[PDB]
Design an enzyme around this catalytic site. Structure first.
Site, short mmCIF file in Angstrom:
data_model
loop_
_atom_site.label_atom_id
_atom_site.label_comp_id
_atom_site.label_asym_id
_atom_site.label_seq_id
_atom_site.Cartn_x
_atom_site.Cartn_y
_atom_site.Cartn_z
CB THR B 1 41.07 36.27 42.35
OG1 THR B 1 40.51 37.44 41.76
CG2 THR B 1 41.81 36.58 43.64
CD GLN B 2 45.83 33.63 39.83
OE1 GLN B 2 45.81 34.75 40.33
NE2 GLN B 2 46.46 33.36 38.69
CG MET B 107 38.40 40.74 37.73
SD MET B 107 39.55 41.92 38.50
CE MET B 107 39.47 41.38 40.21
CD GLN G 1 39.52 39.21 45.87
OE1 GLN G 1 38.96 38.34 46.55
NE2 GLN G 1 39.57 39.16 44.55
#
Ligand SMILES: *C(=O)[C@H]1NC[C@@](C)(O)[C@](O)([C@H](CC2CCCCC2)NC(=O)[C@H](CCCC)NC(=O)[C@@H]2CC(F)(F)CN2C(=O)[C@H](C)NC(=O)CN=[N+]=N)O[C@@H]1C
Ligand SMILES: *C(=O)[C@H]1NC[C@@](C)(O)[C@](O)([C@H](CC2CCCCC2)NC(=O)[C@H](CCCC)NC(=O)[C@@H]2CC(F)(F)CN2C(=O)[C@H](C)NC(=O)CN=[N+]=N)O[C@@H]1C
Ligand SMILES: *C(=O)[C@H]1NC[C@@](C)(O)[C@](O)([C@H](CC2CCCCC2)NC(=O)[C@H](CCCC)NC(=O)[C@@H]2CC(F)(F)CN2C(=O)[C@H](C)NC(=O)CN=[N+]=N)O[C@@H]1C
Ligand SMILES: [Cl-]
Ligand SMILES: [Mg+2]
Ligand SMILES: [Mg+2]
Ligand SMILES: [Mg+2]
Ligand SMILES: [Mg+2]
Lengths: 204, 225, 195, 211, 195, 226, 222, 195, 195
Positions: B1-2, B107, G1
């Site tokens: 995740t970024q 992810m 997110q």
């Protein structure tokens, strides 16, 4: 938590040839627990019928309120409120509570006493009117009721055919919702005679 | 995740009778700052495929290297690398789709939406989309980000269904793409006037046009308001 | 709180209500009457938040007793229940709603018929042959669905309630220190002093 | 809603056949009893996938036991394989409530409650799921050790019907099982659609409903 | 992107024409320069609603003032804006420049940022676009410029702010406030982009 | 919802799709979004359906009374002002997005209004889920000096773009043409390009098919004489 | 997110006949209120006379169909070109899905074909691999609109014999392929009307002892 | 505030000298121009820890490169920074300008923003203070400037960025990279504030 | 956590442990033995999270049985309690701690003395003349502080335990369905069948 699905239950209405039908399940639950098999959701003010789904306290309160309002209407106008006008009265009355609404899905059905024209209408909880020709659906099994109606329904049904169609639309919709069923009532409404039928459906 | 940092906006594309067209502006945005004004977001692979990339430009530069490294590797112990065992659009696409879905499944996605535009060996038009989720779809017209909302409605008035493709010429198809880029300049807050356009034709090959500009702009009515 | 049952038989209504009052990890009292006479032929049982229960019970009582004096007449169970419901339905949209559930058991001297009403803190009213609030219903409803008959005598009614309390003393986690049982019939309200 | 109880004449096992996705009824005709072998039944309540997958797996572990030890597995052991498996998975959010009901010679008729918190309990009576309390109300207030096979089968069927009626998340039909020293016997599928009315008429019960 | 510059002959106000909702351009040819009196203008930045609601009220306050006490001073227009923006600071996202030409004090520029403070300045820049031209404006502004110089200084400044700011674009509108009256200037992409 | 408004040589035209939706479900396949504030001032609405309908009717009423008190045809700028001050007072909580268009003594007008109370002028406008689809067509085909015929075409094409390419929009194209010195003409179901085809089957059942527990007659009438 | 799931809409329908089965799916692909494609096939022939659809998140659906197709290839290699039976296919798919129990494939899966007695078979799965054989199943966006219709018009539910006043249920008969296709077409016409995610195209795959046939029908494009 | 500009003779890098911990100035005379090689330099913006950690590793890699393969291209230095910055994008707050002088390629400027992307430009500005000089720098940069014109352009550009940005200040250090080698230049407040 | 008591008298340790196993709104079982024999003269009672309680107890039972075979010898009560504390102390800093509290009642055949050890899930060990885990203690500690004498017989220690169980049945919110009681003395471990 979601007030519109604590008590559960459904209403549907349909137009036919010089007639209307309005039907409802009989359930009142507290979520999983069934409490009552006799909670009717369809009331009548003169010749105008109102079905109401959603939070049951509001169902009862709105019925008590519209009885009140149509009684005074009749004393001042010296005639029974017509379906078109009552529809406006429901919409007005719900929109008055815009920022504290009644958690309900009302449905109006009845025949205009002067034009003989069959009439149905539904409302969101803040009184936006949906005036479909064909059919109106409301409650926890609305998705299902839309599916049954849209496939089953054809226009200009005779009262005794329409009865079959709305009965089968409600029954099969209710058997696919955990919070509907437990019994059902169908009103067949003609310009000057109204037949009320209790349906045999599964009690689970 | 970024989170995406330097970004490129819409890529827009359509099939026509004898091949595909793809276009994209030359802007690397940095939030609301229009930071980099010479970014090339159409990346040709061989003479039969152009890859157009929107989203994070750091992830685009990585994907560009992956494609340069795919050309090298396919030439290894391959005497038919410039003939029958050359990279196809459908090979390059399937590779990108695999990488995108794998990256999202760890992810840690490549924060992009990609459109592979090319002509196959047999002369069939290739046009397919993939994004940071590994979702893939084909259609006579494909656009990313803003272009989905504004380019597709305009380009679908020309090719509404497969049967329209053989009736669409390259001049009509290109005019539609050029107009679409003008509408996106008017309406997308993070677009530029300066764009690139590539045509892949089953007869004339790959035509790559750099430093195009939006022109024939209507601003006249402004004085009246 | 937690245990209020009502069963309407042939010619009476039977309210059974837990004697336990528990705050935290102590049972403070084991003899609590969770009931108020509203009129000589109407009894109301109640369960819900501390304080609210009695403040609501006593408030309703005072109004019904006022109506009785003013009109020198006793409101029907139906009328009392409708009054009570509307009070709750008004409370639910108040700054601080009354967190109280009630059963209303009454003998209607005009219709010569016992009536049980179940109303929840939202103002949700229903007439039932048998009712319960909170967790109790999870056991007693299916039990009564099997064993109830409309034409049962008060003695059969009391045996049927004993079945319900035993099932609750077997399968409920908390100790509700037994029930106080009261019969509403044509001769008024009396407490069953041995249960 | 699922139950199983021991009596004079062995074990009665009864389950509904409803699957729910929130308020959506996904199916009315689903199976909640897995036949592990001729003398071993497992009941299923909770996550549909968790129950099917880990119980057909338990079936595989029970088969490997009898190849390795040349002997059908004890109910005690069969249950403890499952309770040790879900205990490994504790806090990962497995949702399973099971009764492992069977006969072996060393144990007699035996029921073990196993749940995904890793609780394992031996007992004569258990009801499991959303409608267990409903079933418990009818079962507990009619249960004697000395029920006939005919009476027990009926009390089991009627206890489910009870929960089928009141619990919004139980229903469809009743699947019935009798377990003896000679193994398990299926005693049919009973649609609540016809059973509710038949039972209402014959028993004079369910007076709460419009007849 | 909005600015005002006070020069020899009077004052000049300039703006872009972009109204955006997120990254969508809702209107690409809006007029952000609004007249408060005959030769008193505001340039609006922030919420479309908040700025418009305020500007409408200030119009009304000066129309009423004119009826009672004749032409208000540019300072007085600025004060009305400050008073509204300071007293309603918790619910306003509005950054305002007020420019006016009287015959006594000549060109004046006032700026009202979020807080609702007031600042009298030779020139003011504001809006998202302004950040990118603090350097350019500071190095290029002189006092006592001509009309041609001031229109040019503002053309170049906003030209740069449009180029670098995604939240700015379209035409550059200006308004020239001198003794002679009000002059409306427009500059289109083709004219300013090639600067 | 997809709504547009397009100014032309001698007036203003307003168009809308005919689909109303509860989440992903379609409630009304032939809904009417084209509402009348006064005889020659129409608007169309997106967002909270109730909110837009309430606000049209409230401002329609007050405009009718104003018109009577002033003895003048009502003006659009008035409807505009009343709407924006009401919506602003309510801080966005009244989710009403409206394109308002009329002809009045002052001429032809076209305005938009957003729930927070911001207003917008232009020669063409769009609003709703379908607004980007509509604005693509408007930006591609709009010119100065449109005729009535060209403006209706351009308005309907802009709604069509919404119908096909936006899931939030569908069914028919409703138009209203307000031309200077003429009565407004409201073309309900102007275009009708989404008629359901004949079903393969009639589902009319045989009478007796449903199981009935109890019949009875209901008295709708009042209590009778004698 | 970062959210690794999306929703590509669409709706699928499985009906089991006596000696055939059908698996139908609209060809519309969407995200939010945008159309991605008007013809993105969703129902796949997997060989061995099995047809499969994984409706929901197209990335997860494509991945699963691909993995199952691979599983059929590796079954031919490992078990001497043996035909994978539908009941065996379903158990394999249960394991594919449950493999990802703690990062699920967001799909509703239907497979169809014949059982080992030549009779029509439909099996449906949840995301995490729970599964049952059924005569009927709708999945995806309009599942709630279509299932009730199929309970009524396939298993004759709440339908009685006229003049038996609820004593005798309508007897449940097998349906022709012609009658099944009519109920499929009417289901997708109704679903297209009342659901914004369903439309554009209908693709039906029909499985008999002779193989997999396709039929295509235009749907409303609004 | 940091920039690099490519001119005729070679290339010039410049920076402010401020290190701050919130609104506190921790060091007012810090050197943010760090040598990677003999005529390759980097300018650091972002976290003090992240920029230092990275510049030390790049220096290590280019020292190794030099041993094995000889003097590395300016491109190659940019590449090593890009790789560190991209592969570690989720734990780095660093924006880097890389300037160097080969005798083949002459002057070269590369910028590596937070992305881990890399861009080749005729000049590059970065750091907090850069936002205010986009307008100025765009308008004032020409190609093929002289050393003295390039030093002026940077001195003017960074003076503005220091003046407007609170997070920038102290001295302007520059590094002039030409065939002649490396010239280190410093400009104090009293020089550049009065421009 | 349910109710588990222990009391060491002259020549024995007595462990009383509730029989209820409760899951949500249902008492699933009312005959549960919350005890494992660790060796012939050492009994451990346990209460805490479901699964963890049995799994931890059986694990400990296996480990002590293993020791007993290996050394053909019975660990002292002191030794077993040290073993059990260390497992829990290791458990608390694990990925998923054992949520179990235990009493260990043991007759040391060497010193001819009964020994009661109280150990929480943190591994907090204490030797006590009486102990409890959970809410039980809040009533039973002060009670036994009054009544308990050091030289009491096993009969007196059982009457003293009837006092503790009556106080809990009177003042505890939950129905724990009575206790199974066990005596650990020189002749081993036996169960009182009537309590
Ligand atoms: C008696 O007490 C019964 N109560 C009814 C019951 C439904 O609660 C249940 O526990 C059944 C038992 C299953 C039925 C299938 C066969 C094995 C036993 N439980 C469910 O039906 C189960 C409850 C879920 C919550 C614990 N339902 C599901 O898991 C449903 C079933 C499904 F098919 F629809 C899939 N599913 C899901 O929850 C799926 C995985 N999730 C979603 O659709 C939402 N995710 N997204 N996007 O039976 C007792 C015996
Ligand atoms: C120069 O610096 C300019 N940059 C752009 C700007 C945003 O700073 C702005 O202030 C403009 C110009 C307004 C135009 C109206 C007259 C006053 C000046 N501001 C906006 O365009 C305003 C920005 C919001 C955040 C700063 N946009 C809106 O209010 C738009 C208008 C709307 F209707 F669409 C609704 N809206 C919204 O922002 C609302 C809040 N909507 C949303 O957030 C989501 N979409 N919707 N509905 O001009 C500077 C001078
Ligand atoms: C031009 O644009 C310059 N702007 C100034 C600048 C200070 O922001 C900075 O980015 C410098 C560049 C570095 C300086 C170190 C040597 C290499 C170049 N950045 C910092 O000074 C840096 C800012 C952090 C925010 C981006 N400061 C620190 O990291 C300081 C150093 C420290 F030690 F003190 C600790 N620290 C902190 O920030 C610590 C972590 N404290 C906090 O974060 C919060 N403290 N509080 N309250 O140069 C631009 C080029
Ligand atoms: Cl808004
Ligand atoms: Mg139901
Ligand atoms: Mg049920
Ligand atoms: Mg209630
Ligand atoms: Mg400074």
């Amino acid at each position: 938590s979601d007030p519109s699905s604590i008590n559960g239950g459904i209403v549907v209405a349909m137009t036919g040839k010089d007639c209307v039908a309005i039907a409802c399940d009989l359930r009142l639950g507290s979520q999983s627990l069934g409490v009552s098999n006799k909670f009717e959701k369809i009331f009548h003010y003169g010749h105008v019928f109102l079905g109401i789904t959603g939070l049951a306290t509001d169902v009862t309160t709105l019925n008590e309120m519209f009885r009140y309002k149509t009684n005074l209407y009749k004393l001042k106008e010296e005639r029974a409120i017509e379906p078109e006008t009552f529809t406006q009265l429901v919409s007005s009355s719900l929109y008055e509570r815009r920022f504290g609404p009644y958690f309900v899905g009302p449905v109006v059905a009845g025949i205009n006493s002067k034009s003989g024209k069959p009439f149905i209408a539904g409302f969101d909880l803040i009184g936006c009117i949906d005036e479909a020709k064909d059919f109106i659906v409301s409650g926890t099994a609305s998705d299902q009721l839309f599916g049954m109606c849209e496939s089953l329904y054809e226009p200009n049904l005779e009262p005794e055919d329409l009865f079959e169609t709305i009965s089968q639309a409600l029954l099969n919709a209710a058997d696919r919702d955990a919070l509907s069923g437990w019994g059902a009532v169908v009103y067949i409404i003609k310009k000057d005679e109204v037949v009320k039928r209790y349906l045999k459906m599964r009690q689970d | 995740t970024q989170q995406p940092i330097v970004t490129g906006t819409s890529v827009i594309s359509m099939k026509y009778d004898n091949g595909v067209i793809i276009a994209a502006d030359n802007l690397g945005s940095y939030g609301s700052l229009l930071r980099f004004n010479g970014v090339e977001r159409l990346i040709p692979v061989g003479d039969n495929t152009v890859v157009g990339i929107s989203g994070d430009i750091s992830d685009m530069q990585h994907i560009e290297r992956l494609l340069k490294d795919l050309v090298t590797e396919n030439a290894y112990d391959n005497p038919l690398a410039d003939a029958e065992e050359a990279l196809e659009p459908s090979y390059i696409f399937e590779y990108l789709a695999t990488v995108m879905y794998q990256r999202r499944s760890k992810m840690n996605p490549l924060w992009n939406a990609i459109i592979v535009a090319g002509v196959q060996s047999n002369g069939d038009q290739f046009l397919r989309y993939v994004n940071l989720l590994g979702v893939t779809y084909s259609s006579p017209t494909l656009a990313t980000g803003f272009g989905a909302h504004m380019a597709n409605p305009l380009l679908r008035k020309v090719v509404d269904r497969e049967s329209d493709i053989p009736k669409t010429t390259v001049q009509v198809a290109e005019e539609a793409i050029v107009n679409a880029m003008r509408v996106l300049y008017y309406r997308d807050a993070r677009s530029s006037r300066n764009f690139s356009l590539a045509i892949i034709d089953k007869n004339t090959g790959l035509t790559f046009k750099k430093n195009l500009q939006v022109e024939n702009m209507k601003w006249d009515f402004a004085k009246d308001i | 709180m937690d245990i209020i049952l009502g069963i309407r038989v042939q010619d009476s209504v039977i309210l059974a209500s837990s004697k336990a009052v528990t705050r935290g990890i102590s049972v403070l009292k084991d003899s609590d009457d969770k009931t108020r006479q509203l009129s000589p032929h109407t009894l109301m049982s109640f369960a819900g938040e501390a304080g609210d229960t009695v403040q609501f019970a006593e408030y309703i009582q005072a109004n019904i007793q006022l109506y009785s004096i003013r009109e020198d007449y006793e409101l029907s169970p139906q009328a009392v229940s409708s009054f009570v419901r509307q009070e709750l339905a008004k409370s639910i949209r108040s700054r601080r709603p009354y967190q109280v559930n009630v059963l209303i058991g009454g003998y209607d001297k005009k219709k010569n018929k016992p009536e049980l009403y179940q109303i929840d803190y939202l103002g949700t009213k229903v007439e039932l042959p048998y009712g319960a609030h909170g967790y109790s219903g999870f056991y007693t409803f299916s039990l009564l669905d099997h064993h109830y008959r409309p034409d049962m005598t008060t003695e059969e009614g009391l045996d049927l309630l004993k079945l319900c309390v035993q099932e609750l003393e077997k399968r409920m986690p908390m100790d509700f220190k037994g029930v106080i049982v009261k019969i509403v019939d044509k001769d008024g309200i009396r407490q069953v002093d041995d249960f | 809603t699922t139950l199983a109880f021991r009596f004079q004449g062995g074990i009665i096992v009864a389950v509904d056949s409803r699957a729910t996705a929130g308020n959506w009824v996904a199916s009315q005709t689903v199976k909640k009893v897995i036949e592990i072998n001729p003398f071993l039944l497992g009941t299923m309540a909770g996550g549909a996938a968790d129950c099917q997958f880990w119980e057909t797996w338990l079936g595989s572990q029970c088969r490997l036991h009898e190849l390795r030890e040349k002997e059908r597995i004890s109910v005690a052991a069969a249950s403890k394989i499952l309770s040790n498996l879900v205990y490994q998975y504790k806090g990962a959010g497995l949702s399973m409530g099971t009764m492992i009901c069977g006969y072996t010679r060393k144990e007699g008729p035996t029921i073990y409650y196993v749940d995904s918190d890793g609780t394992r309990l031996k007992g004569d009576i258990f009801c499991v799921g959303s409608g267990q309390t409903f079933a418990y109300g009818v079962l507990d207030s009619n249960y004697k050790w000395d029920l006939s096979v005919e009476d027990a089968l009926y009390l089991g069927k009627r206890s489910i019907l009870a929960a089928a009626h009141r619990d919004a998340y139980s229903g469809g039909s009743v699947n019935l099982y009798h377990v003896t020293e000679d193994g398990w016997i299926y005693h049919g599928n009973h649609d609540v659609g016809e059973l509710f009315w038949k039972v209402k008429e014959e028993e004079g019960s369910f007076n709460n409903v419009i007849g | 992107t909005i600015m005002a510059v006070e020069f020899d002959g009077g004052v000049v106000m300039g703006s872009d024409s972009r109204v955006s909702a997120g990254e969508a351009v809702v209107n690409r040819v809006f007029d952000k320069l609004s007249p408060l009196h005959e030769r008193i203008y505001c340039a609006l930045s922030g919420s479309a609603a908040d700025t418009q609601a305020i500007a409408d009220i200030v119009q009304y306050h000066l129309e009423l003032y004119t009826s009672q006490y004749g032409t208000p001073s540019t300072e007085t227009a600025a004060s009305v804006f400050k008073e509204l923006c300071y007293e309603n600071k918790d619910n306003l996202t509005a950054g305002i420049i007020v420019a006016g030409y009287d015959d006594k004090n000549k060109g004046e520029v006032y700026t009202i940022p979020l807080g609702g403070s007031v600042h009298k300045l030779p020139y003011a820049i504001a809006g998202s676009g302004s950040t990118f031209i603090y350097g350019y404006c500071d190095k290029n502004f002189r006092e006592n410029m001509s009309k041609e110089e001031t229109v040019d200084f503002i053309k170049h400044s906003l030209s740069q702010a449009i180029k670098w700011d995604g939240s700015s674009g379209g035409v550059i509108r200006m308004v020239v406030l001198t003794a002679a009256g009000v002059e409306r200037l427009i500059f289109y992409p083709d004219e300013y982009e090639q600067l | 919802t997809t709504i547009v408004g397009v100014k032309f040589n001698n007036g203003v035209v307003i168009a809308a799709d005919t689909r109303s939706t509860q989440g992903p479900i379609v409630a009304d396949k032939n809904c009417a979004k084209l509402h009348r504030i006064s005889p020659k001032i129409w608007c169309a609405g997106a967002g909270t359906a109730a909110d837009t309908e309430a606000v049209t009717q409230l401002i329609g009423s007050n405009i009718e009374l104003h018109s009577l008190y002033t003895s003048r045809e009502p003006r659009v700028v008035s409807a505009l002002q009343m709407l924006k001050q009401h919506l602003f007072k309510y801080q966005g909580h009244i989710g009403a997005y409206l394109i308002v268009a009329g002809v009045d003594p002052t001429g032809s007008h076209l305005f938009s209004i957003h729930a927070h109370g911001s207003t917008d002028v232009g020669y063409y406008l769009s609003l709703g889920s379908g607004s980007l689809a509509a604005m693509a067509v408007l930006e591609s085909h709009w010119k100065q000096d449109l005729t009535k015929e060209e403006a209706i075409k351009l308005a309907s094409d802009a709604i069509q773009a919404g119908i096909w390419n936006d899931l939030g929009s569908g069914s028919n194209v409703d138009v209203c043409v307000m031309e200077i010195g003429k009565d407004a003409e409201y073309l309900r179901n102007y275009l009708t390009p989404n008629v359901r085809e004949e079903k393969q089957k009639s589902y009319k059942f045989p009478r007796g098919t449903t199981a009935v527990l109890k019949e009875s007659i209901v008295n709708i009438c009042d209590i009778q004489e004698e | 997110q970062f959210n690794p799931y999306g929703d590509n809409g669409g709706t699928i329908l499985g009906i089991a006949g006596e000696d055939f089965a059908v698996l139908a799916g609209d060809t519309r692909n969407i995200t939010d209120y945008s159309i991605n494609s008007r013809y993105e096939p969703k129902v796949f022939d997997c060989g061995d006379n099995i047809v499969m659809s994984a409706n929901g998140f197209a990335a997860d659906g494509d991945a699963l169909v691909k993995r199952f197709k691979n599983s059929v290839k590796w079954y031919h290699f490992d078990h001497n070109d043996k035909k994978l039976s539908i009941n065996s296919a379903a158990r394999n798919i249960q394991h594919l899905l449950y493999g990802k129990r703690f990062f699920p494939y967001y799909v509703h899966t239907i497979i169809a074909g014949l059982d080992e007695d030549g009779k029509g078979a439909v099996y449906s799965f949840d995301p995490v691999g729970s599964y049952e054989r059924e005569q009927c199943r709708a999945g995806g966006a309009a599942a709630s609109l279509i299932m009730p219709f199929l309970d009524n018009q396939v298993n004759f539910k709440n339908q009685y014999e006229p003049g038996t006043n609820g004593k005798v249920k309508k007897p449940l008969k097998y349906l022709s392929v012609e009658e099944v296709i009519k109920l499929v077409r009417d289901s997708f016409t109704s679903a297209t009307e009342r659901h914004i995610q369903v439309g554009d195209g209908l693709e039906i795959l029909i499985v008999t002892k002779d193989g997999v046939r396709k039929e295509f029908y235009e749907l409303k494009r609004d």
